[PDB]
């Protein structure tokens, strides 16, 4: 349960055949993996001490990827899948490569962060579109059954996670790009003193 609107109801089931798996990879910040560049500054030939939001070395990961075939369960939209954003997250994503008539396509899951996920508040949503990211962070009206379809070899359902005839009001809007031939992507998200 994330939203409150009734956007679509085609195949609603109730099954429990999923469980988050603990990864076998360990966080190694020896060569830089796990640390982030500071804000738009440049340091040259120096050694600094930075007090910030970083992950703990010697930890394990947890997977939250969900995939289905025209079937959605109510338990998928609850805990432990609907985790809590205490102070921040560091995520590693695998670049799923597909081929449609010997043409490379890249697509992975999307993330949605918010507080109550209602139209009276803001909500950040990050999703890729064939090597092009999309960060909006707008006051979207998302329903309690959000999902996303694949452009290549599409599914029976249609992409419908927000129902807004007109674009709502927000502060940020921008697109980004990335290499489509890579294999792993990394993301850092956090907030401090109300600044995300």
């Amino acid at each position: 349960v994330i939203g409150d609107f009734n956007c679509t109801n085609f195949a609603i089931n109730d099954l429990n055949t999923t469980v988050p798996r603990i990864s076998e990879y360990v966080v190694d910040v020896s060569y830089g993996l796990g640390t982030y560049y500071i804000l738009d500054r440049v340091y040259l030939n120096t050694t600094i001490l930075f007090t910030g939001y970083f992950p703990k070395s010697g930890a394990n990961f947890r997977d939250l990827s969900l995939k289905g075939t025209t079937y959605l369960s109510t338990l998928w939209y609850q805990k432990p899948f609907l985790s809590d954003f205490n102070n921040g997250i560091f995520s590693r994503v695998k670049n799923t490569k597909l081929y449609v008539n010997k043409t490379l396509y890249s697509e992975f899951s999307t993330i949605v962060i918010g507080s109550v996920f209602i139209n009276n508040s803001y909500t950040i949503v990050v999703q890729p579109h064939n090597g092009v990211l999309e960060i909006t962070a707008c006051q979207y009206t998302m329903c309690e059954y959000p999902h996303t379809i694949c452009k290549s070899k599409g599914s029976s359902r249609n992409e419908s996670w927000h129902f807004d005839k007109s674009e709502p009001l927000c502060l940020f809007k921008k697109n980004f790009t990335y290499n489509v031939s890579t294999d792993w992507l990394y993301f850092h998200f956090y907030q401090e003193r109300g600044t995300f």
Binding site: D40, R41, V42, L44, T46, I48, L169, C170, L171
Partner: protein, 97 residues
């Protein structure tokens, strides 16, 4: 009086930059005063706009409108030495260094 479709026409105009003069700056959210220069930097990236010091100072910046790197220097702010004698009416001034 409520929205995000505002106009930057009268808010703050951008005209130019000045060189070899102590001027005030409000660049990228950080304010200060000093003299700018012109250098040829190659250590800037697509997301990097400032060159910072290892102690909490600004070394330089890069203007995205014309794609050229500068170098901000602090301008002179010092005192003067004055020698005075009782029998005299004027003073002897010394600007050190």
């Amino acid at each position: 009086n409520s929205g995000t479709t505002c106009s930057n026409d009268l808010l703050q105009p951008n005209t130019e930059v000045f060189t070899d003069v102590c001027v005030d700056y409000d660049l990228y959210g950080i304010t200060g005063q000093g003299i700018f220069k012109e250098v040829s930097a190659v250590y800037y990236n697509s997301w990097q706009n400032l060159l910072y010091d290892s102690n909490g100072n600004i070394i330089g910046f890069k203007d995205f409108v014309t794609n050229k790197t500068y170098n901000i220097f602090p301008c002179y702010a010092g005192r003067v030495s004055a020698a005075f004698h009782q029998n005299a009416s004027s003073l002897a001034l010394l600007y050190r260094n």
